[PDB]
Amino acid sequence: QYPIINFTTAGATVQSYTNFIRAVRGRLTTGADVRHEIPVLPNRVGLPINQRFILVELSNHAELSVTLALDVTNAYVVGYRAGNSAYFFHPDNQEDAEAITHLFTDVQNRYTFAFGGNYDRLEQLAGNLRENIELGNGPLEEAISALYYYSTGGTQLPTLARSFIICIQMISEAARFQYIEGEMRTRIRYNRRSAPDPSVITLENSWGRLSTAIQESNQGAFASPIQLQRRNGSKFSVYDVSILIPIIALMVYRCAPPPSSQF
C-alpha cells in the first residue's frame, strides 16, 4: 500500500544518492503547500492513515536489506523491518501507537522499543553524541548490517542506537535540508567518512524552530533571529527566509499560511 523508495550503499554515487533523496522528498510532500519557495510536509490533522507513511528499502554490499518506515508529517523514522521482525520506537501518543499498527502488517514478530527515537535518547544509548558519530556511505553500509542482525543477537544496543543515528541523518535530515544532503554527497563523492560538523548539528536541532519562524514570519521576516553555527562553530544569525531557501528543502507543518495579502 505505502510507497517504497529503494536505495543501496553498494556502489553508491553522488548521482544515485541524489536520485534517492529527490524521490524521498517527492513521496513525503504533495506540492499542496509551498511557502517562500519552501515545501511543507502534510498536516497531521485529518491526514488519512493510507497516506501517513512511506517506506525506504535500504540494501547494502553485504546483500542485506532493511525497510525503514517514515512518517510523512515530520519525516521521522518510526521503525524498521528486517526479515521476520519489525521494531518501532516508543510512540509519543495513542494516535501514533494506532498509526504504526498499519505498518509491516504481515511480519511474524512485532516489537515496540520501550525507548523513544529522538536524538537525545539514541545518543545516550549509543554512548556517543552525533558530533562523534561518523557519517558516509561506509557508516550507512555498516548501519544496514547492524539493523539486519539485531533480532538474532549480533548487534549490541549501543551499535543499534548509533546505526539509527546514521540512518536518520543520511535519510531524514538529508531530505529536510539540501545543505545536509550536500554534506552527505561530499562524503560519498570522496568515500570519506566523518562526523557531522556544527553547521549540520545546529540545522538538525533547529528544524522545528526554523519551520515555525518561516511560517509565522511577516512576509519572510523573522520576529526573532535564529542562531545557527558555521562549520568552525562560530555564530550565524538568521533573520529571514531568503537565506534559508538554498538550505532547507522541507518544513514540518506548524501553522496555516496567512492570506496572500498582495499590495
Identify the CATH number of the domain in which residue 153 sits. Answer: 3.40.420.10
Q: Is 140 annotated as a binding residue?
A: yes
Opening angle at CA 236, ends 255 and 193, nearest 5: 95
Give how many domains the chain has, as a whole number: 1
- Mode of pairing for the β-strands spanning 221-229 and 109-112: unpaired
The reply to whether 68 sits in an annotated binding site is: no
Q: What angle do CA 239, 195, 171 make, to 5 degrees?
A: 70
CA distances from 106 to 16, 77, 156, 235 (A): 30, 19, 26, 49
Angle at 184 between CA 177 and CA 250, to 5 degrees: 15
The technique is X-ray
Q: Is 43 annotated as a binding residue?
A: no
Is the residue at 137 inside a domain? Answer: yes
253: in domain: no
Contacts of 248 (CB under 8 A, 6+ apart): 38, 176, 177, 178, 179, 203, 207, 210, 211, 214
Q: Grid cell 506540492 — which residue? A: 31
Residue 218 placed within a domain? no
The residue range of the domain holding 139 is 4-190
Phi, psi of 9 (to 5 degrees): -80, -20
Active-site residue set: 76, 119, 173, 176
Q: Any known ligand binding at 243?
A: no
Please indicate, yes or no, if residue 252 is contained in any of the structural domains.
no
Is 35 annotated as ligand-binding?
no
CA distance 100 to 105: 9
Residue 70 lies in a domain: yes
